[PDB]
Design a protein around this ligand. Structure first.
Ligand SMILES: Nc1ncnc2c1ncn2[C@@H]1O[C@H](COP(=O)(O)OP(=O)(O)O)[C@@H](O)[C@H]1O
Ligand SMILES: [Mg+2]
Lengths: 371, 139, 747, 7
């Protein structure tokens, strides 16, 4: 009996069996409903579409994400996603081997309680556990001292882990993410006179951002270069066949991670919160956290975000204590790979929340047994 | 022992005196007791002799008067038959087996002694009537 | 109490593990007055008893269950006397046949003796290996269920010599016109050269279980054979402890590095290559590897594996050695590289016929891929070295499996195999000054195979018990399952080993700590030495054994990156190399788990079959013929499980006598007045007079079952009674004699 | 969420 692992990404679910190298199922966590009167009788319609169903039909649909900012906002959509995950794509009855689910830290208590409830009552899973993603990124990167910048959709957070101990008071959480990058990128593209106004083309701008964006190693010289010369501009075929051409706007979007002030965000960016997260730590460990400094999650995939982070923290750190970055190319999957190895540890098999214990203690069980 | 017994025993004792001093050796005491009708074991003979050491057993000489308490102490059929039935169920015993056990266990005798007592008592098959042999050796 | 004046006892001693002693004055309740054969008295002390000695009728017997004190000294004595004074080399102990290597040639194996043993039942004869092969062959003839002979010990002890004669027996009695007698023995030089290795304590130790099926048709003609192998210790290829060697073939190659046939392999001396140099001991005294290479090639040629295949095998092995020299420059914690012109890889690529730039790319990187996208990822120097060594182990294990398939290809016949008799050679229980993962696996396998032996014995003695209507409750199954559950099962010592194989920055220190956290006070069979936090102790079946945790994890890790296999499958140059690979999870599985599985395939081969057991014992190191070091033999008898079997049997009813044989002995202990026209009732009464009847010994339908000592007690009273009777009768005859000398004087 | 933000 091999456990299941699936990751409740705020944008893209990742699922497979424990001890697999990379997930078998990957599909956007998106639920599509038709918004038009279909005329044909005998069409063979169905009510609504999940994941890879709703991508191809998106022009006909309205698309909702049930998860925003690591919070499951519509559990009735969410159930459909899990149902599709286990039965349709995996071809597994979840009742027959256990399951592991992954969460951003410090999200509201209900997300754990109601996820556990739905797992035991609805799917009748043998046993369950939930785990902090930025813990698993260290299992994935092969380390036990770490500071982790984790950014998916929805959430960015810093969690320090020194020699296997977490430091709860040092956790930083922030709400810049690929969604707010995209919703900024549409408004900056409007400056060129391109318009994207409904959900079915948000999924176009997301692909534009994925292919073309990059981060300036130093921003203001390259902003002036773009104002000086067009050699930065590159062009993209919209799905119909209309070309669009984009210039400084492609780097200006991922800059907002470093200057959230463009979004109108209150906080500092991921560099200065990373440094403040180290500054919360005691002075014995900071030297080690500067070396084992890890990038995790897909929003960290922009070309050059590593070298930009290394530069801008080097300008904050003491000159003598050298600082490093770790940014493996897999890292989009690293939270899953870490969950896959974690679930397969013989030592872990005691840790599962079994259904008997849940029936004893109720949905409150999670906070007691789990981190 | 009465005077007649003491006289017969003294005469017999003097017959065993091979030096003329009226004495026998400790090692002859058992022989004299057996010649006089006693059947002590060698262990019993040494016990009544006081478990003597080799040197005095072979060269120390004692007169009748010291021997006499020992003779007294030594002096003071169905078991014998069952003992022979040990080596039996046609009432016979191989001569070879009796010879082997008498020459190899217990207070071992010489092969010549065993041949001497066994001489004429075994038949052509080599069997001894043990009830008759026992009565014969007890006569 | 049995102890009396002129009783005998054994006493411990350094220079013979036991010495004879005679009890010089009766014991009653703290120090014993004992005569010794070297001095009239020395005195022996009783502390928080000495083991008694068996009576003379019992000693020297054909079967160690016929003894009445089941003691290490009694076992050692019976073996010593049979070996030295009678030149009897085979002995029985329960089911087992104990063979003691005569280590000299002897005229025992001729045709007339084969014709003597064929047709007998097991107990009808003095023990001999033919009395095992016949016991198997008849049960195959009787029944559907076919047969397997298991042979255990150190490889020096002559197991090949046992199998040789078992096969000769089958081939002679079968009535077969085939000729497996030659081809099987002709295979042994290659199977050693690939599968046999010099260990720290012994030369030419075999490191795998070799299973020969002998096939019979429906007519019980021998049609052929099928060789299998199991439990190979792959890890020896890439690692050794001090003064070991890896498998002989690499040295037989490095001695032939001079020769015209092998020029292109560019072999150096054995210190030139990282896999051969680690042991620090190229030479084995008295053996030219260079000559043994000739016998190996002639054996290949006599099996008819082609000269081209032979040159391919040798070029693969040179490949492996050149692979093991490739050396990685660290660039970063997460990256390493191979230097720009590096000669070992340059030669390896030419031997294998591959592009240098692809080996160099794939040796330093791994490929990760979900079905939508693929990432090519750098790895640490440590992981790249582990991957290199796991590739060398994979190439070797596949070559071994291919050579064994060509052997079977020569050994099978097109005739249908109707049934088979298997002969299994497997290593005995192993313990040294220093114990490692290799010994740990060898001992775990011996724990399995001793569990099976204990099952088989217990089942057959419950058959004998009901054949005599004696109740099954009396026999107890002595069970080592709590040790197997400790090693084998989840949260066990192997499972926690693989767990730190996969856990980040695992190490021997933290694995040892995880052991202590999980077992130290929780299990009776697991212990830790006081002075060390880097070892553990198992109260293991034959002995306590201390395993040193330095470098299990380095040996246990096996992972092979499929890209590095597939690059080799890309070789056009020569047939063999793609042949090896042709036919996943297997690449992820560690050495320990692959061993645990191979052991299940072994057990599920044996459990389908009727066992028979042989044990082999090495009398001395020095190759002295027919001399017997008590120090050595007691160690072998422990390592063979013989002593622990005998200690398991003493807890039962060791000694069995037929009523008329008992009466034939103990009539002396009886009186005709008591005896009756039925011998069974007579002995039932007499013996119940002589002993506490019910619990102490028992009556079966046909046989009388005693606990161990009690036959000796009967011999003791019988002997003393017989002596007393003899003494009385002879003192009577002495009195008659001195009366006759008085008659001489009257004459 | 429930207050300080859209979720
Ligand atoms: N190669 C890429 N470059 C830039 N952004 C990407 C890339 N791949 C995914 N993203 C964006 O990051 C988010 C998905 O990241 P992911 O780690 O899958 O989040 P989660 O695991 O929380 O669902 C989406 O906003 C997606 O558009
Ligand atoms: Mg994520």
């Amino acid at each position: 009996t091999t456990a299941l692992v699936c990751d409740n990404g705020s944008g893209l679910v990742k699922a497979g069996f424990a001890g697999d190298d990379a997930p078998r199922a990957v599909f956007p966590s998106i639920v599509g409903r038709p918004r038009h009167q279909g005329v044909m009788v005998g069409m063979g319609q169905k009510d609504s579409y999940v994941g890879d169903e709703a991508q191809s039909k998106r022009g006909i649909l309205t698309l909702k994400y049930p998860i925003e900012h690591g919070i499951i906002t519509n559990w009735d959509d969410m159930e459909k996603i899990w149902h599709h995950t286990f039965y349709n794509e995996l071809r597994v009855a979840p009742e027959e081997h256990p399951t592991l689910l992954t969460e951003a830290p410090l999200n509201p208590k209900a997300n754990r309680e109601k996820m556990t409830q739905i797992m035991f009552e609805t799917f009748n899973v043998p046993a369950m556990y939930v785990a902090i993603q930025a813990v698993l990124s260290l299992y994935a990167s092969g380390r036990t001292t770490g500071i982790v910048l984790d950014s998916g959709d929805g959430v960015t957070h810093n969690v320090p882990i020194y020699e296997g101990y977490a430091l709860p008071h040092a956790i930083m959480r922030l709400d810049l993410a690929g969604r707010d990058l995209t919703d900024y990128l549409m408004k900056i593209l409007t400056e060129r006179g391109y318009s994207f106004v409904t959900t079915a083309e948000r999924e176009i701008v997301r692909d534009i951002k994925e292919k073309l964006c990059y981060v300036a190693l130093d921003f203001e010289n390259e902003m002036a270069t773009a104002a000086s010369s067009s050699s930065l501009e590159k062009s993209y075929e919209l799905p119909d066949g209309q070309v669009i051409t984009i210039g400084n706007e492609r780097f200006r979007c991922p800059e907002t991670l470093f200057q959230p002030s463009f979004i109108g965000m209150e906080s500092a960016g991921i560099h200065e919160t990373t440094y403040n997260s180290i500054m919360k730590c005691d002075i014995d460990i900071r030297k080690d956290l500067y070396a084992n400094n890890v990038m995790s999650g897909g929003t960290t995939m922009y070309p050059g975000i590593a070298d930009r982070m290394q530069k801008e923290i080097t300008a904050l750190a003491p000159s003598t204590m050298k600082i490093k970055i770790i940014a493996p190319p897999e890292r989009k999957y690293s939270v899953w790979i870490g969950g896959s190895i974690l679930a397969s540890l013989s030592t872990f098999q005691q840790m599962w929340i079994t259904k008997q214990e849940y029936d004893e203690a109720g949905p409150s069980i999670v906070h007691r047994k789990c981190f | 022992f009465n005077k007649d017994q003491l006289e017969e025993f003294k005469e017999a004792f003097e017959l065993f005196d091979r030096v003329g001093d009226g004495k026998i050796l400790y090692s002859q005491c058992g022989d004299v007791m057996r010649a006089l009708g006693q059947n002590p074991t060698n262990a019993e003979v040494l016990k009544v002799l006081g478990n003597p050491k080799s040197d005095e057993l072979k060269s120390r000489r004692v007169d009748f008067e010291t021997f006499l308490p020992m003779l007294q102490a030594v002096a003071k059929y169905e078991d014998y038959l069952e003992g022979f039935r040990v080596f039996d169920g046609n009432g016979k015993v191989m001569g070879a087996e009796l010879r082997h056990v008498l020459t190899t266990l217990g207070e071992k005798m010489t092969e010549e002694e065993v041949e001497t007592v066994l001489a004429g008592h075994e038949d052509s098959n080599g069997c001894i009537n043990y009830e008759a042999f026992l009565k014969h050796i007890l006569s | 109490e049995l102890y009396t004046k002129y009783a005998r006892v054994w006493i411990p001693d350094p220079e013979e593990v036991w010495k004879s002693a005679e009890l010089l004055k009766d014991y009653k309740p703290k120090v014993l007055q004992l005569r010794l054969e070297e001095g009239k008295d020395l005195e022996y002390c009783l502390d928080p008893l000495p083991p008694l000695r068996n009576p003379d009728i019992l000693v020297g017997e054909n079967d160690l269950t016929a003894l009445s004190y089941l003691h290490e000294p009694a076992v050692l004595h019976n073996l010593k006397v049979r070996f030295i004074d009678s030149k009897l080399i085979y002995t029985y102990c329960g089911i087992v046949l104990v063979a003691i290597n005569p280590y000299e040639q002897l005229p025992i194996y001729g045709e007339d003796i084969i014709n003597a043993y064929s047709g007998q039942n097991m107990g009808d004869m003095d023990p001999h290996i033919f009395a095992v092969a016949e016991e198997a062959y008849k049960q195959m003839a009787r029944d559907e269920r076919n047969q397997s002979i298991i042979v255990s010990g150190e490889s020096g002890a002559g197991k090949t010599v046992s199998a040789k004669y078992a096969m000769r027996y089958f081939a002679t009695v079968s009535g077969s016109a085939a000729n497996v007698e030659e081809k099987v023995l002709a295979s042994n030089p290659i199977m050693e050269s690939i599968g046999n290795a010099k260990t720290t304590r012994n030369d030419n130790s075999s490191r795998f279980g070799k299973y020969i099926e002998i096939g019979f048709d429906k007519r019980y003609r021998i049609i052929g054979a099928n060789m299998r192998t199991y439990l190979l210790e792959k890890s020896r290829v890439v690692f050794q402890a001090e003064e070991e060697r890896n498998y002989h073939i690499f040295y037989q190659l490095c001695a032939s590095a001079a020769l015209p046939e092998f020029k292109t392999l560019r072999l150096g001396n054995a210190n030139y290559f990282h896999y051969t140099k680690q042991g620090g001991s190229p030479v084995i005294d008295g053996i030219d590897d260079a000559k043994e290479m000739v016998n190996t090639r002639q054996a290949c040629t006599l099996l008819g594996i082609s000269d081209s295949y032979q040159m391919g095998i040798f070029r693969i092995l040179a490949g492996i050695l050149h692979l093991g020299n490739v050396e990685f420059a660290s660039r970063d914690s997460d990256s390493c590289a191979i230097p720009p012109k590096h000669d070992p890889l340059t030669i390896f690529c030419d031997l294998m016929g591959v592009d240098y730039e692809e080996m160099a790319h794939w040796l330093c990187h791994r490929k990760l891929a979900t079905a939508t996208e693929t990432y090519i990822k750098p790895i640490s120097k440590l992981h790249a070295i582990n991957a290199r060594d796991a590739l060398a182990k994979h190439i070797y294990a596949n070559l071994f499996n291919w050579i064994v398939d060509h052997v079977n290809k020569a050994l099978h016949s097109t005739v249908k195999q109707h049934s088979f008799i298997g002969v299994l050679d497997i290593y005995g229980f192993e313990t040294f000054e220093i114990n490692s993962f290799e010994q740990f696996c060898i001992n775990y396998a011996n724990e399995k195979l001793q569990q099976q032996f204990n099952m088989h014995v217990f089942k057959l003695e419950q058959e004998e018990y009901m054949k005599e209507q004696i109740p099954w409750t009396l026999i107890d199954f002595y069970d080592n399952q709590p040790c197997i559950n400790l090693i084998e099962a989840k949260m066990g010592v192997l499972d926690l080993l693989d767990e730190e194989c996969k856990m980040p920055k695992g190490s021997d220190d933290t694995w040892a700590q995880k052991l202590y956290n999980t077992h130290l006070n929780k299990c009776a069979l697991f212990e830790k030495p006081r002075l060390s936090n880097k070892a553990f102790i198992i109260k293991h079946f034959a002995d306590k054994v201390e395993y040193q945790c330095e470098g299990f994890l380095e040996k246990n890790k096996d992972t092979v990156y499929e890209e590095q296999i597939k690059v080799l499958k890309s070789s056009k140059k020569f047939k063999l190399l793609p042949e090896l690979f042709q036919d996943s999870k297997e690449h992820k599985k560690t050495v320990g788990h692959q061993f645990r599985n191979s052991l299940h395939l072994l057990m599920e081969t044996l459990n389908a079959t009727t066992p028979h057991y042989v044990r082999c014992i090495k009398p001395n190191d020095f190759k002295f013929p027919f001399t017997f070091d008590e120090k050595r033999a007691v160690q072998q008898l422990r390592a063979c499980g013989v002593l622990e079997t005998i200690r398991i049997s003493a807890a039962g009813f060791p000694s069995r006598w037929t009523y008329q044989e008992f009466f034939s002995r103990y009539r002396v202990l009886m009186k005709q007045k008591d005896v009756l026209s039925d011998r069974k009732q007579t002995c039932k009464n007499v013996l119940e007079k002589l002993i506490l009847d019910k619990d102490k010994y028992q009556f079966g339908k046909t046989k009388i079952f005693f606990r161990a000592g009690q036959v000796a007690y009967l011999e003791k009273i019988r002997a003393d009674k017989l002596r007393a009777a003899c003494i009385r009768i002879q003192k009577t005859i002495r009195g008659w004699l001195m009366r006759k000398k008085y008659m001489r004087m009257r004459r | 969420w429930x207050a300080x933000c859209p979720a």
